[PDB]
Structure formats: C-alpha cells, structure tokens
Amino acid sequence: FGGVSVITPGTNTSNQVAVLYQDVNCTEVPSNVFQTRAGCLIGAEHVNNSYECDIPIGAGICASYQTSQSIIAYTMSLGAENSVAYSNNSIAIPTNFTISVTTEILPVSMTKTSV
Amino acid sequence: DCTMYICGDSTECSNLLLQYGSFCTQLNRALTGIAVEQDKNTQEVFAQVKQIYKTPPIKDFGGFNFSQILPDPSKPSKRSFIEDLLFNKVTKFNGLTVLPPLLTDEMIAQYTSALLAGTITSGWTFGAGAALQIPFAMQMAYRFNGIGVTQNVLYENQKLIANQFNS
Amino acid sequence: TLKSFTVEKGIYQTSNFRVQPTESIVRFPNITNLCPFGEVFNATRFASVYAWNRKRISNCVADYSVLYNSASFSTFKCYGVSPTKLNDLCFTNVYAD
Amino acid sequence: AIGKIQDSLSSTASALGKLQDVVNQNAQALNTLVKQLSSNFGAISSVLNDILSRLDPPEAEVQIDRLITGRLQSLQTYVTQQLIRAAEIRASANLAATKMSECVLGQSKRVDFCGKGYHLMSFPQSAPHGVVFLHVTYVPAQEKNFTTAPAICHDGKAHFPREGVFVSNGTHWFVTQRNFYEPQIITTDNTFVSGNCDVVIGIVNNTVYDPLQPELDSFKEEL
Amino acid sequence: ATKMSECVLGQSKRVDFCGKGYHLMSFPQSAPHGVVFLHVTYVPAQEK
Ligand SMILES: *[C@@H]1O[C@H](CO)[C@@H](O[C@@H]2O[C@H](CO)[C@@H](O)[C@H](O)[C@H]2NC(C)=O)[C@H](O)[C@H]1NC(C)=O
Ligand SMILES: *[C@@H]1O[C@H](CO)[C@@H](O[C@@H]2O[C@H](CO)[C@@H](O)[C@H](O)[C@H]2NC(C)=O)[C@H](O)[C@H]1NC(C)=O
Ligand SMILES: *[C@@H]1O[C@H](CO)[C@@H](O[C@@H]2O[C@H](CO)[C@@H](O)[C@H](O)[C@H]2NC(C)=O)[C@H](O)[C@H]1NC(C)=O
Ligand SMILES: *[C@@H]1O[C@H](CO)[C@@H](O[C@@H]2O[C@H](CO)[C@@H](O)[C@H](O)[C@H]2NC(C)=O)[C@H](O)[C@H]1NC(C)=O
Ligand SMILES: *[C@@H]1O[C@H](CO)[C@@H](O)[C@H](O)[C@H]1NC(C)=O
Ligand SMILES: *[C@@H]1O[C@H](CO)[C@@H](O)[C@H](O)[C@H]1NC(C)=O
Ligand SMILES: *[C@@H]1O[C@H](CO)[C@@H](O)[C@H](O)[C@H]1NC(C)=O
Ligand SMILES: *[C@@H]1O[C@H](CO)[C@@H](O)[C@H](O)[C@H]1NC(C)=O
Ligand SMILES: *[C@@H]1O[C@H](CO)[C@@H](O)[C@H](O)[C@H]1NC(C)=O
Ligand SMILES: *[C@@H]1O[C@H](CO)[C@@H](O)[C@H](O)[C@H]1NC(C)=O
Ligand SMILES: *[C@@H]1O[C@H](CO)[C@@H](O)[C@H](O)[C@H]1NC(C)=O
C-alpha cells in the first residue's frame, strides 16, 4: 500500500498527468515507468539533463512540463557550477556597480473572525 | 492516513466514519502542510547561494588547514570528516508512512561545500554578489579590521593564529 | 479532491493504493466429531437452581443450526456475541450450564 | 529599478502569493467550519429543527447531545488551528516590525536582512493584511583581476593601508577602496607604518610618496 | 537561517550571536535534520 500522488501542470496548459505511487515498488502497480526513492513514478519521461525544480516529488527528483510537450522527470540542479580563480596574490575588485530594488512581502494580520 | 489508521480494511467502519464529514481530510491537510514547510525550512536555511563554488586543488590558504571541514573525495558521498562524525552519532503498517525529504544528504553536503568554498575564497563578497577571490591572509585582515583590531596584528602573528586555528 | 474544476500546477495527494485480495483462505482443525449438545439440551432430568450443572465441551464442531431452527425456545438472548455469526468462529472452550 | 518593480507587480500575480495563501487558508478554515454543520455525527439528521420537530425530549436530548459533541469537536479544532495560525502570523508581523525599525527607520548592516547585496535603505508600501518592502541595495557589476600584496616595503619598514588594499595593474602599484576600483598613488597619508619587512608573508618592494619632499625641492632652489 | 546569512555569508557585530567573544567568521557543517556551525572567535588571553 501507499499514497497516490498526481503530478500535473495547470489545467489551462495541459490535461496530461503523471502518477506517483508513494513508498512502493514498480511490481504490484497494475511504458514510461520510472523508479525513485519516493516511490514508483508512471507517466513521466526520465531525462538526464538537470533543471530547476518546478513540481517537487522527493529524493531530489522534480517534474516539469517541457518539450511535443510532455511531463519529464529529472534530478534537481543545485545551480550553475562556478569555480573561483583563487590565488595567493590575485584580487577581484569591482570597477562598476548597479542599484537594484528587491520586493520583500511579509504577512502582518489576518481576518478578525468571531464565532 | 486517517482512514487507514481509524478504520483499516473495514467498509463498515469507513461508512460510520463518513458521518463525521471532513474531519479526516483536515488532519491529512495539516500534516501535508507540515511536510511542505519542513522542506521549506531546509531550502531557506541551506539554499542561500546562487552558484555551487568549489575550492582550487592547491590548498594555499596561508597556513590555515581546512582538510577537516572540506569534503573528502574518497567517500561515496562528498562529505567532510567532521560531517561524518556527526552523521554516525545521531541515530509502521497502520497507514503511518515517512516521506523522504526533497533534498538528500548528498545535496546538503554539496550546499555546505559550496558555502564553505565561497566563504574561504571570497569573504562576504559571494554573499553580497558575484564572488571576488581574496587571499586568505588579507581576508583574515578584513575580519580583524572588522573587530577593531589593526591588521598589523594578523600579519606579524599569522603563524601563531594558523597554529591556534588548527589546534 | 480539490473540489474544483480547475487544478493549479503542482503535486496533490488524491487517494491511496491498496492491493486487493484474490481469494479467501479458511482454515480450521480437521476434526469431525459430533458435538454433545444433544444430551445437554434433551436430557430427561435437569439440575436444580443452586446445584446447576456445568458441562465442559471440547473437541467438536458445532453448527448451532438446530439451536437456530428450534422454535420451542421461548426466550433466546445472546449478549457478548451475536447469535447468527456463531459457526464462523472457533472458540477455546464452551460451558453449558 | 522602480519601473521594473512596477512592471513585475503588474505582470506577475504570484508575487503576492505570501498574502494570498494566508487569505486562502482563512477561507479554507471558515469553509470547513461551515461545512461541518452538515455532518450527522451519528444522529438521525444534521438539522436541529428536523430533530426537534420529529422527536420528543427523551430521544431529542440524545440526538442533540450527539450534534453538540460533533460541533464542539469541530469548533475546538477550528479554534486550535486559528490559534496556531495566529501565532505564526504574529511571528511574521514581529519580523516585519523588526525589518521596518532596522531597515526603513535606519540602515541595516546585517547581511541579507534587507534583500540581496549591500543594503542602503528601504520603502514601506501598504498591502492587504500585510506590508511590502522595496529594499534599495548596492550590488557590484563589473570586475577586473589585479595583483595584490598585503604590505609594501619603502625603506625597510612595512606599510599597511589605512583604507583599502594594495593592487597592481602590472607595472605600478596602487591603493583603492574595497568595494570600488579607484586607484590612488600610495602615499604616507594613505598608509601607516608598523614593523619591518622580515615578518610579513608576501610583502613587495615599492616607493611610498611623501607629501613634504616637493616643497623641499623648492627649498634647494630656496637655499 | 538568520545565523547563516549574518554569520557565514558575512561578519556579525552582534555580541554572542555567533559564539562567545569577538566573532570573526563561521563554517557550516551538515547534520541529521539540523545544521552545525563552527564559529571562529577572537578572545583576549593575557592582560596587564
Ligand atoms: C557602469 O555601468 C553602467 C550601466 O549599468 C554604464 O552606463 C551606461 O553607459 C553606456 C555607455 O557605454 C550608455 O550607452 C548607457 O546608456 C549607460 N546606461 C545608463 C543606465 O545610463 C556606465 O557607463 C558604466 N560605467 C563604467 C565606468 O564602466
Ligand atoms: C591538515 O591536517 C591534516 C590532519 O588533520 C593533515 O593530514 C595528515 O598529514 C600527515 C602528513 O604530514 C599524515 O601523516 C596524516 O595521516 C594525515 N592525516 C589525515 C587525517 O589525513 C594535512 O597534511 C594538513 N594539511 C596542511 C596543509 O597542513
Ligand atoms: C598602470 O597604471 C599606470 C598609471 O596610470 C600606467 O602608467 C601610465 O601609462 C600611460 C599610458 O597609458 C602613460 O601615458 C603615463 O605616462 C603612465 N604614467 C606613469 C606614472 O608611468 C601604466 O601604463 C599602467 N600599466 C598597465 C599595464 O596598464
Ligand atoms: C626588496 O628589496 C630589498 C632591498 O631593499 C631586498 O633585500 C635584498 O635581499 C637580498 C637577498 O637576501 C640581499 O642579497 C640584498 O643585500 C638585500 N638588499 C639590501 C639593500 O640589503 C629584498 O630581497 C627585496 N624583496 C623582493 C621580494 O624583491
Ligand atoms: C491558461 O492557458 C490559456 C491558454 O490555453 C491562457 O489563455 C490563459 O491565460 C492561461 N491562464 C493562466 C493564468 O496561466
Ligand atoms: C524492487 O524489487 C526489486 C527486486 O525485484 C529490487 O531489486 C528493487 O531494489 C526493489 N525496489 C524498491 C524501491 O524496493
Ligand atoms: C543517460 O545517459 C546514459 C549514458 O551515459 C544512458 O545510459 C542513460 O540511459 C541516459 N538516461 C536517460 C534518462 O536518458
Ligand atoms: C432434541 O430433540 C429434538 C427432537 O424431539 C430435536 O429436534 C432437537 O434438535 C434436539 N436437540 C438437540 C440439541 O440436539
Ligand atoms: C580572472 O582570471 C581568471 C582566470 O581563470 C578568469 O577566469 C576570470 O574571468 C578573470 N576575471 C576577470 C574579471 O576577467
Ligand atoms: C604564492 O604562491 C606561489 C605559487 O603559485 C608561490 O611561489 C609563492 O611563494 C606564494 N607566495 C606567498 C606569499 O605565499
Ligand atoms: C591588577 O591589579 C589588581 C590589584 O587588585 C590585581 O588583582 C590584578 O591581578 C592585576 N592585573 C594583572 C593583569 O596583573
């Protein structure tokens, strides 16, 4: 036994779904069948390429609706790899700058209900 | 699972419980929200860097030794010796399941490695913006100037400070 | 599950998976001894109220169908176990006072 | 940047999801509390007037007791969830008040407390059951590689920068501030003297310009 | 997360927010369902 999770994009975008059978092997489930540590995933194509996570699944696997378009499964990308040119006599000092404005939104209150 | 817990494999029990309406659904929803927000906490605390940095193969950090905190390439999971000691120390069928975390321990190790490499090679510049490579002696001079202590102190006692840090 | 005709992008837990059983396994000891309820209920003489008899009964198979079938019993009340589902249950010991 | 924030707020509806989830969660709790009145809780009906209009008190008290137990359980669960959500919201509001006091009413030197980069100042904006901050931050953009040294010998003494660090473009050495490239001639006004050249690891050879010498060149003419 | 952002990604001038003494810098280490910080601090030793 195990939980049944449905992986879908927005219904206005597509009606194609991928089904995750949580904490089970891919044997008792009655193509496009993949096996993760989060359970048995059916309907999502396994892709070697890594992307940013869109719909989380578990154990580093995330699903997305990409290209013709279909639901794909892939390992999470933790970011672009960038080695630093470290040396004992090398310094990087900026010569130009930019002024950026970022939006931070925080809740304050909720509905003052009374029953 | 509420129905699996209260009424396992019983149609009659499920029909009786169905008279309680959506008591069952609310409980699952709260637990699902908890399971989401724990991954949210993990991402908030660890995914604070935009890029995965790595140290150069030459560990010329002015005498400072970081081999006990840098990851070990020989291990199956690239984790430090200090990380390994910590992992060793810290140690059913009624619908009670455990969901795996979204971020695995290897990815947590990679995030800590990226943060540690960025810190060691760049000070605070990797957190402020794009990483700026700084030799570790002048980075320690920056930190010493940050506590009201003149940098002459670090350069003239660099060996003493490196030995004390290693000890 | 979402009680809506439009589902937002994401992952949702909708139902649970269960492997249904294929066949039923019924296992009982293969003893075919007739049970002595007949002498208990059809004895010529019954004991006194204070000196009520007690019969220990074991190693038999009990249909109870005659107990259901006889309408001579004016009063028939079962408390701990419902009367109809008696033959489907195997018990350790039964006493007939 | 202000125009970009305006365009982003006009285009992306998921920016205010942090308030939309609070409003939606309150809606879910209210809807669940309303819909829990439809449950029989083991009684003959979920309508109190139906129970009263069909049963005399000897059975009506039992059925009404079943309804009261079910509705009390629903109310207690709703109030407990409301208390937990109110505590979380209180924590968020305390964080928002701290952010205002340390970031709008002053300048915050805490890293990433007021957005990514070197924080300068922030703007408050009103929001439905919330507050929106417009953090103005300083982010370096264009970078260059330079050859550096922790100190400089002049006459056997070790010179360290009062501000900035020593950099070289390949032929000459300069001192410039940490967060912006502004090369200046290394003078005694920019540096201070401590120790000698035999203890620092990485000192290089140069000359430190002294402001008084030129007036002294006029002096040889003066003599 | 606040400790990481203000103590590993930069230098904290808050007293005892990053261990006892004058804080310099910190190291993150992974832990089972947790995080471990190695705060490097400056402590005076000998006095006159
Ligand atoms: C620093 O960067 C800014 C852009 O962020 C530069 O400003 C631009 O300069 C070019 C000339 O090459 C103009 O065509 C653009 O219109 C300018 N942009 C803006 C927004 O004004 C600036 O010149 C750079 N300064 C240095 C010293 O590199
Ligand atoms: C940093 O410290 C480690 C030990 O924590 C050093 O590794 C040791 O190196 C010696 C050789 O001198 C070996 O005999 C030991 O077996 C090593 N120990 C371990 C645990 O690897 C390392 O050499 C030091 N590096 C620097 C640059 O000082
Ligand atoms: C490093 O910077 C110095 C200072 O600007 C440069 O020296 C000048 O170079 C220009 C040529 O562009 C000459 O016209 C000046 O007379 C030089 N000044 C002095 C005091 O020598 C030097 O060329 C730069 N070197 C590099 C490799 O960029
Ligand atoms: C910086 O300049 C000094 C001279 O002012 C150099 O010192 C010389 O070192 C060599 C090697 O030990 C000696 O043979 C010379 O006699 C020293 N000069 C004097 C005047 O005593 C020093 O080596 C230079 N450093 C660098 C890195 O170039
Ligand atoms: C959903 O997709 C449709 C196109 O199929 C598009 O017209 C609509 O605007 C989309 N809605 C949103 C909000 O994404
Ligand atoms: C599923 O069963 C196979 C054996 O048929 C086993 O090798 C595999 O590890 C199992 N997978 C899981 C997730 O239990
Ligand atoms: C990934 O590439 C390997 C070859 O290196 C191949 O064997 C494997 O099937 C690929 N997996 C997917 C999902 O494409
Ligand atoms: C007692 O005898 C009658 C026949 O007169 C029979 O119908 C009944 O089943 C007997 N009772 C038992 C317990 O066998
Ligand atoms: C500095 O040199 C390194 C050499 O590996 C190079 O990768 C980097 O882009 C250089 N930085 C700049 C700003 O050109
Ligand atoms: C810097 O590293 C180089 C090797 O690339 C070495 O020759 C030199 O002595 C080092 N200088 C210092 C001050 O450590
Ligand atoms: C300073 O003088 C006091 C006198 O009471 C003494 O107790 C203290 O130890 C002295 N400090 C040092 C560092 O000797």
PDB file of N, CA and C in Angstrom, chain B residues 45-46 48 66 69 80 82-83 86-87 90 108 115-116 119 124 126-127 136 139-140 143-144 146-147 165, chain E residues 1 4-5 7-11 13 22-32 34-36 38 40 42:
ATOM      1  N   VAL B  45      17.270  27.471   4.837  1.00  0.00           N
ATOM      2  CA  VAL B  45      18.492  27.508   5.627  1.00  0.00           C
ATOM      3  C   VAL B  45      19.702  27.113   4.785  1.00  0.00           C
ATOM      4  N   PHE B  46      19.533  26.285   3.751  1.00  0.00           N
ATOM      5  CA  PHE B  46      20.710  25.811   3.027  1.00  0.00           C
ATOM      6  C   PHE B  46      20.895  26.465   1.663  1.00  0.00           C
ATOM      7  N   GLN B  48      21.059  29.230   0.203  1.00  0.00           N
ATOM      8  CA  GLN B  48      21.293  30.661   0.322  1.00  0.00           C
ATOM      9  C   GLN B  48      22.331  31.175  -0.664  1.00  0.00           C
ATOM     10  N   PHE B  66      42.122  23.410   6.287  1.00  0.00           N
ATOM     11  CA  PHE B  66      40.686  23.190   6.193  1.00  0.00           C
ATOM     12  C   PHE B  66      40.339  21.777   5.747  1.00  0.00           C
ATOM     13  N   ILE B  69      37.249  20.200   7.367  1.00  0.00           N
ATOM     14  CA  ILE B  69      35.926  20.722   7.052  1.00  0.00           C
ATOM     15  C   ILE B  69      35.609  20.666   5.562  1.00  0.00           C
ATOM     16  N   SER B  80      32.642  15.919   4.685  1.00  0.00           N
ATOM     17  CA  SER B  80      33.844  16.128   5.471  1.00  0.00           C
ATOM     18  C   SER B  80      33.964  15.084   6.579  1.00  0.00           C
ATOM     19  N   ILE B  82      34.426  15.909   9.757  1.00  0.00           N
ATOM     20  CA  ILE B  82      33.581  16.417  10.833  1.00  0.00           C
ATOM     21  C   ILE B  82      32.114  16.124  10.543  1.00  0.00           C
ATOM     22  N   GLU B  83      31.709  16.236   9.275  1.00  0.00           N
ATOM     23  CA  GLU B  83      30.342  15.888   8.899  1.00  0.00           C
ATOM     24  C   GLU B  83      30.064  14.409   9.129  1.00  0.00           C
ATOM     25  N   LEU B  86      29.523  13.509  12.842  1.00  0.00           N
ATOM     26  CA  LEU B  86      28.174  13.949  13.266  1.00  0.00           C
ATOM     27  C   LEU B  86      27.153  12.925  12.778  1.00  0.00           C
ATOM     28  N   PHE B  87      27.292  12.449  11.544  1.00  0.00           N
ATOM     29  CA  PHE B  87      26.250  11.544  10.999  1.00  0.00           C
ATOM     30  C   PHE B  87      26.198  10.265  11.830  1.00  0.00           C
ATOM     31  N   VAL B  90      24.144  10.752  15.607  1.00  0.00           N
ATOM     32  CA  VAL B  90      22.693  10.852  15.690  1.00  0.00           C
ATOM     33  C   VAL B  90      22.080   9.619  15.044  1.00  0.00           C
ATOM     34  N   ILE B 108      22.696  18.318   0.567  1.00  0.00           N
ATOM     35  CA  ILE B 108      23.035  19.154   1.719  1.00  0.00           C
ATOM     36  C   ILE B 108      24.546  19.304   1.844  1.00  0.00           C
ATOM     37  N   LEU B 115      28.962  26.737   0.092  1.00  0.00           N
ATOM     38  CA  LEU B 115      29.022  27.865   1.018  1.00  0.00           C
ATOM     39  C   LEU B 115      30.400  27.989   1.654  1.00  0.00           C
ATOM     40  N   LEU B 116      31.000  26.860   2.038  1.00  0.00           N
ATOM     41  CA  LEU B 116      32.309  26.888   2.679  1.00  0.00           C
ATOM     42  C   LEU B 116      33.395  27.334   1.708  1.00  0.00           C
ATOM     43  N   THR B 119      32.935  31.071   1.133  1.00  0.00           N
ATOM     44  CA  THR B 119      33.415  31.800   2.301  1.00  0.00           C
ATOM     45  C   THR B 119      34.935  31.876   2.311  1.00  0.00           C
ATOM     46  N   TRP B 124      32.851  37.845   2.303  1.00  0.00           N
ATOM     47  CA  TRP B 124      31.422  38.112   2.194  1.00  0.00           C
ATOM     48  C   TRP B 124      30.995  38.529   0.794  1.00  0.00           C
ATOM     49  N   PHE B 126      30.833  36.805  -1.988  1.00  0.00           N
ATOM     50  CA  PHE B 126      29.964  35.844  -2.661  1.00  0.00           C
ATOM     51  C   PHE B 126      28.534  35.942  -2.144  1.00  0.00           C
ATOM     52  N   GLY B 127      28.363  36.337  -0.881  1.00  0.00           N
ATOM     53  CA  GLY B 127      27.022  36.569  -0.372  1.00  0.00           C
ATOM     54  C   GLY B 127      26.456  37.901  -0.823  1.00  0.00           C
ATOM     55  N   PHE B 136      43.652  34.410   1.658  1.00  0.00           N
ATOM     56  CA  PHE B 136      43.038  34.199   2.961  1.00  0.00           C
ATOM     57  C   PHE B 136      43.698  35.036   4.049  1.00  0.00           C
ATOM     58  N   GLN B 139      41.925  38.245   3.744  1.00  0.00           N
ATOM     59  CA  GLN B 139      40.558  38.057   4.230  1.00  0.00           C
ATOM     60  C   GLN B 139      40.511  38.060   5.757  1.00  0.00           C
ATOM     61  N   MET B 140      41.457  37.370   6.400  1.00  0.00           N
ATOM     62  CA  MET B 140      41.577  37.442   7.853  1.00  0.00           C
ATOM     63  C   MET B 140      41.918  38.854   8.319  1.00  0.00           C
ATOM     64  N   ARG B 143      38.654  40.588   8.468  1.00  0.00           N
ATOM     65  CA  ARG B 143      37.906  40.190   9.660  1.00  0.00           C
ATOM     66  C   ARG B 143      38.489  40.814  10.923  1.00  0.00           C
ATOM     67  N   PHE B 144      39.818  40.932  10.993  1.00  0.00           N
ATOM     68  CA  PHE B 144      40.453  41.570  12.140  1.00  0.00           C
ATOM     69  C   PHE B 144      40.139  43.060  12.188  1.00  0.00           C
ATOM     70  N   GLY B 146      37.412  44.219  11.137  1.00  0.00           N
ATOM     71  CA  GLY B 146      36.006  44.272  11.496  1.00  0.00           C
ATOM     72  C   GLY B 146      35.725  44.216  12.985  1.00  0.00           C
ATOM     73  N   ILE B 147      36.715  43.867  13.805  1.00  0.00           N
ATOM     74  CA  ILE B 147      36.540  43.807  15.250  1.00  0.00           C
ATOM     75  C   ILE B 147      37.392  44.858  15.962  1.00  0.00           C
ATOM     76  N   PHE B 165      44.329  28.058  15.191  1.00  0.00           N
ATOM     77  CA  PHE B 165      43.138  27.619  14.472  1.00  0.00           C
ATOM     78  C   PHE B 165      43.178  26.122  14.188  1.00  0.00           C
TER      79      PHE B 165
ATOM     80  N   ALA E   1      18.789  30.021   9.780  1.00  0.00           N
ATOM     81  CA  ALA E   1      18.954  30.728   8.514  1.00  0.00           C
ATOM     82  C   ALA E   1      19.463  32.147   8.735  1.00  0.00           C
ATOM     83  N   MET E   4      23.128  31.854   9.530  1.00  0.00           N
ATOM     84  CA  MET E   4      23.911  31.633   8.318  1.00  0.00           C
ATOM     85  C   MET E   4      24.092  32.925   7.539  1.00  0.00           C
ATOM     86  N   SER E   5      22.989  33.645   7.308  1.00  0.00           N
ATOM     87  CA  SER E   5      23.023  34.826   6.454  1.00  0.00           C
ATOM     88  C   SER E   5      23.867  35.935   7.065  1.00  0.00           C
ATOM     89  N   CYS E   7      26.265  35.405   9.488  1.00  0.00           N
ATOM     90  CA  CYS E   7      27.462  34.982  10.196  1.00  0.00           C
ATOM     91  C   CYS E   7      28.413  34.184   9.317  1.00  0.00           C
ATOM     92  N   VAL E   8      27.893  33.445   8.341  1.00  0.00           N
ATOM     93  CA  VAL E   8      28.731  32.732   7.383  1.00  0.00           C
ATOM     94  C   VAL E   8      28.924  33.549   6.115  1.00  0.00           C
ATOM     95  N   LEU E   9      27.841  34.149   5.619  1.00  0.00           N
ATOM     96  CA  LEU E   9      27.893  34.979   4.423  1.00  0.00           C
ATOM     97  C   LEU E   9      28.448  36.370   4.697  1.00  0.00           C
ATOM     98  N   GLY E  10      28.731  36.700   5.946  1.00  0.00           N
ATOM     99  CA  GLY E  10      29.315  37.982   6.304  1.00  0.00           C
ATOM    100  C   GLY E  10      29.940  37.900   7.677  1.00  0.00           C
ATOM    101  N   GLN E  11      30.112  39.058   8.309  1.00  0.00           N
ATOM    102  CA  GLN E  11      30.659  39.145   9.656  1.00  0.00           C
ATOM    103  C   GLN E  11      29.633  39.809  10.559  1.00  0.00           C
ATOM    104  N   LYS E  13      28.417  41.710  13.953  1.00  0.00           N
ATOM    105  CA  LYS E  13      28.924  42.555  15.066  1.00  0.00           C
ATOM    106  C   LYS E  13      27.987  42.438  16.270  1.00  0.00           C
ATOM    107  N   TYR E  22      34.675  38.013  20.364  1.00  0.00           N
ATOM    108  CA  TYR E  22      34.614  38.797  19.134  1.00  0.00           C
ATOM    109  C   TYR E  22      34.549  37.840  17.952  1.00  0.00           C
ATOM    110  N   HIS E  23      33.396  37.792  17.293  1.00  0.00           N
ATOM    111  CA  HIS E  23      33.205  36.885  16.172  1.00  0.00           C
ATOM    112  C   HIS E  23      34.000  37.342  14.957  1.00  0.00           C
ATOM    113  N   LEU E  24      34.599  36.380  14.255  1.00  0.00           N
ATOM    114  CA  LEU E  24      35.297  36.654  13.007  1.00  0.00           C
ATOM    115  C   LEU E  24      34.555  36.076  11.809  1.00  0.00           C
ATOM    116  N   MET E  25      34.345  34.761  11.785  1.00  0.00           N
ATOM    117  CA  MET E  25      33.696  34.067  10.677  1.00  0.00           C
ATOM    118  C   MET E  25      33.345  32.658  11.134  1.00  0.00           C
ATOM    119  N   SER E  26      32.496  31.994  10.355  1.00  0.00           N
ATOM    120  CA  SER E  26      31.927  30.718  10.759  1.00  0.00           C
ATOM    121  C   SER E  26      31.952  29.745   9.589  1.00  0.00           C
ATOM    122  N   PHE E  27      31.857  28.458   9.916  1.00  0.00           N
ATOM    123  CA  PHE E  27      31.790  27.392   8.935  1.00  0.00           C
ATOM    124  C   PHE E  27      30.486  26.621   9.072  1.00  0.00           C
ATOM    125  N   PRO E  28      29.800  26.339   7.971  1.00  0.00           N
ATOM    126  CA  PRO E  28      28.638  25.451   8.027  1.00  0.00           C
ATOM    127  C   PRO E  28      29.036  23.990   7.923  1.00  0.00           C
ATOM    128  N   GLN E  29      28.340  23.147   8.684  1.00  0.00           N
ATOM    129  CA  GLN E  29      28.504  21.705   8.578  1.00  0.00           C
ATOM    130  C   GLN E  29      27.136  21.044   8.610  1.00  0.00           C
ATOM    131  N   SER E  30      26.952  20.041   7.756  1.00  0.00           N
ATOM    132  CA  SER E  30      25.680  19.338   7.686  1.00  0.00           C
ATOM    133  C   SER E  30      25.493  18.429   8.895  1.00  0.00           C
ATOM    134  N   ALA E  31      24.237  18.255   9.289  1.00  0.00           N
ATOM    135  CA  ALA E  31      23.870  17.446  10.440  1.00  0.00           C
ATOM    136  C   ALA E  31      22.569  16.730  10.117  1.00  0.00           C
ATOM    137  N   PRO E  32      22.280  15.592  10.784  1.00  0.00           N
ATOM    138  CA  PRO E  32      20.995  14.919  10.545  1.00  0.00           C
ATOM    139  C   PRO E  32      19.825  15.742  11.050  1.00  0.00           C
ATOM    140  N   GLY E  34      19.445  18.929  10.814  1.00  0.00           N
ATOM    141  CA  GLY E  34      19.970  20.089  11.510  1.00  0.00           C
ATOM    142  C   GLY E  34      21.194  20.620  10.802  1.00  0.00           C
ATOM    143  N   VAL E  35      21.757  21.679  11.381  1.00  0.00           N
ATOM    144  CA  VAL E  35      22.961  22.316  10.866  1.00  0.00           C
ATOM    145  C   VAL E  35      23.886  22.607  12.044  1.00  0.00           C
ATOM    146  N   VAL E  36      25.192  22.497  11.810  1.00  0.00           N
ATOM    147  CA  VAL E  36      26.205  22.709  12.836  1.00  0.00           C
ATOM    148  C   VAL E  36      27.125  23.829  12.376  1.00  0.00           C
ATOM    149  N   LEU E  38      30.554  26.201  13.072  1.00  0.00           N
ATOM    150  CA  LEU E  38      31.861  26.273  13.719  1.00  0.00           C
ATOM    151  C   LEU E  38      32.277  27.739  13.747  1.00  0.00           C
ATOM    152  N   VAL E  40      34.372  30.812  14.544  1.00  0.00           N
ATOM    153  CA  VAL E  40      35.746  31.188  14.855  1.00  0.00           C
ATOM    154  C   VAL E  40      35.718  32.567  15.496  1.00  0.00           C
ATOM    155  N   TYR E  42      37.485  35.605  18.349  1.00  0.00           N
ATOM    156  CA  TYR E  42      38.702  36.225  18.854  1.00  0.00           C
ATOM    157  C   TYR E  42      38.512  36.522  20.337  1.00  0.00           C
TER     158      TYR E  42
END
